[PDB]
Write an enzyme that holds these catalytic residues in place. Structure first.
Site, PDB file in Angstrom:
ATOM      1  N   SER B  91       0.717  -0.957   0.244  1.00  0.00           N
ATOM      2  CA  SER B  91      -0.351  -0.372   0.087  1.00  0.00           C
ATOM      3  C   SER B  91       0.526   1.098   0.004  1.00  0.00           C
ATOM      4  CB  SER B  91      -0.831  -0.206   1.175  1.00  0.00           C
ATOM      5  OG  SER B  91      -1.750   1.231   1.323  1.00  0.00           O
ATOM      6  N   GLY B  92       0.410   2.215  -1.054  1.00  0.00           N
ATOM      7  CA  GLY B  92       1.492   3.238  -0.756  1.00  0.00           C
ATOM      8  C   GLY B  92       1.998   4.384   0.400  1.00  0.00           C
ATOM      9  N   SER B  93      -0.043   4.341   0.602  1.00  0.00           N
ATOM     10  CA  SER B  93       0.064   5.670   1.823  1.00  0.00           C
ATOM     11  C   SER B  93       0.429   5.185   2.787  1.00  0.00           C
ATOM     12  CB  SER B  93      -1.673   5.956   2.082  1.00  0.00           C
ATOM     13  OG  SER B  93      -2.302   4.950   1.917  1.00  0.00           O
ATOM     14  N   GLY B 237      -2.178   4.961  -4.018  1.00  0.00           N
ATOM     15  CA  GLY B 237      -0.538   4.529  -4.235  1.00  0.00           C
ATOM     16  C   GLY B 237      -0.321   2.987  -5.601  1.00  0.00           C
ATOM     17  N   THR B 238      -1.232   1.904  -4.360  1.00  0.00           N
ATOM     18  CA  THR B 238      -1.814   0.655  -5.711  1.00  0.00           C
ATOM     19  C   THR B 238      -2.224   0.736  -7.085  1.00  0.00           C
ATOM     20  OG1 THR B 238      -3.220  -0.002  -4.190  1.00  0.00           O
ATOM     21  CG2 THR B 238      -1.322  -0.086  -3.542  1.00  0.00           C
TER      22      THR B 238
END
Lengths: 305, 305
Positions: B91-93, B237-238
């Site tokens: 996960s980006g965040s 983000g993903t």
């Protein structure tokens, strides 16, 4: 490294599944000569409300209560209730959480089997009786502020319908569902809008001069001295207090009876010049933790979102 | 008095307005020989997830990350991501929040102007570069796991439509809005349902064998080497990593370019036997506080609600 412009100390709590977290430190009492005026500052200023209620620290269902010193010497502690929608004169579930935090976390000493306290909410004093056992404040019973019906069977243009208005720590326009439907949230708000426009609301001894929400109900069912009623609120202890005041006004509930939406119609009173009831609201609560809220000076969402 | 069956220590954090709180103590690492297996325990067992994600302690928008020891010796710390909907490989965040908590709260030492770390997410190692200034990890850039398109222009029965499927740390079926509409949440889930039924998804070197969400998009706009695209996800983000993989596959994005939904297509890779991209996701985060979560033994909502 971290930075914070403030640190707010909270004991988390919920009552029968309603969050009522409690600020126990880090916040000076708001300006004001009375707890009422202090709550009006909190409602107007919004800094504390937004900081504790909004993401990323809160959430849409969070309620938070700020302990403040009592202004009335009969009270042991004052509190200001911050709900998502408003900063109301009283709240059942939140008064239960405040009582539970005060006793379970040792701020006020605990006697068993029963501890009695007097607290000061913005809307006036409340009497609290806590059933306490083995260190736990298991169940809290709160004598809510005087509650009453303002208008009964008032006609309101929206179709064209009939409503009641009432106060039980907050203000409601109350409507039977079948008399319209059984979507509700959407109809609820227009009804509240219309009620404010055409009926208004004025509390006889407090400066609460509008209707906050719409309660949509279905007919109560009776089993002995217990009434059960299905309802919902379009934007509950003040809900039940307000509804009990209407049921009593219309003769469908008598003194000494209970209502389950526990609430109890303990006695009648006079307020302004008109009949009111004294509701006792009761429930269990549990502490969910402790927290220290912070705000980095560079955080571009100081008021959350 | 209070009682608690456990105490979980959290540093709260959000990245560009997405909550990614971080458990720093009170939770032993889950069973499992790899961080992947540990995340699968967390997803299956649900005890930790429900306790930190659900009311009365969490909220529908809360994400929480559990720090665990690295299993791969190249990593300085491992983490398991707990989102509302799933327990994803990356996960980006959340990786930005984890990085920020690790550096801002002093768990990993800070160098300025830049600190580099290697972290281990369930889906593999991620390389982190933090721009640090005056004690603050101001901006984090994360090399996400290899991301790729699985199917392009696949026909799917729902009308009858065309979709792409892709992985960027989680799995998406991606659909142009106009090719259907411009409600979305409702259509999104049936599309995801249908995509799982008729296309499926299988990651070449990880055991992620379904499509988690539907991304509904509108056409990108280009300004030099920056692409901007409007999108929404029916249950980022993903999301951006997955979308970049599709744009690259269809020739609408080239290596070195940026995408704003910041994301950057840093280079190409091979994964399985097929093309993939290495996305760099970047954002700012801020610590929002500390907390100690507790559970009274008598609380009838041990898993929250």
């Amino acid at each position: 490294s971290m930075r914070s412009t403030k640190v707010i100390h909270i004991v988390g709590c919920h009552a029968e599944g309603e969050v009522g977290d409690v600020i126990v430190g880090g916040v000076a009492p708001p300006p004001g000569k009375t707890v009422w005026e202090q709550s009006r500052f909190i409602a107007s200023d919004e800094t504390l409300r937004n900081f504790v209620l909004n993401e990323p620290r809160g959430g849409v269902f969070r309620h938070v209560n700020l302990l403040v010193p009592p202004k009335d010497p009969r009270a042991q502690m004052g509190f200001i209730i911050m709900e998502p929608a408003d900063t109301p004169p009283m709240s059942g579930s939140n008064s239960i959480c405040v009582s539970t935090v005060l006793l379970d976390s040792g701020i006020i000493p605990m006697q068993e089997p029963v501890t009695r306290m007097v607290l000061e909410a913005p809307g006036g004093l409340i009497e609290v009786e806590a059933e306490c056992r083995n260190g736990k404040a298991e169940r809290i019973s709160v004598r809510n502020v005087p509650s009453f019906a303002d208008r009964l069977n008032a006609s309101l243009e929206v179709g064209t319908i009939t409503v009641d208005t009432a106060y039980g720590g907050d203000s409601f326009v109350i409507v039977d569902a079948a008399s319209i439907g059984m979507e509700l949230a959407e109809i609820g708000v227009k009804i509240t809008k219309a009620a404010n426009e055409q009926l208004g609301f004025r509390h006889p001894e407090k400066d609460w001069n509008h209707i906050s929400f719409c309660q949509i109900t279905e007919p109560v069912t009776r089993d002995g001295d217990i009434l059960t009623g299905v309802n919902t609120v379009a934007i509950t202890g003040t809900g039940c207090s307000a509804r009990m005041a209407v049921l009593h006004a219309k003769g469908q509930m008598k003194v000494g009876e209970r209502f389950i939406g526990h609430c109890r119609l303990d006695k009648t009173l006079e307020l302004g010049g008109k009949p009111a009831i004294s509701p006792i609201i009761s429930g269990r609560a549990w502490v969910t933790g402790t927290s220290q809220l912070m705000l980095d000076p560079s955080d571009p969402f100081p008021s959350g979102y």
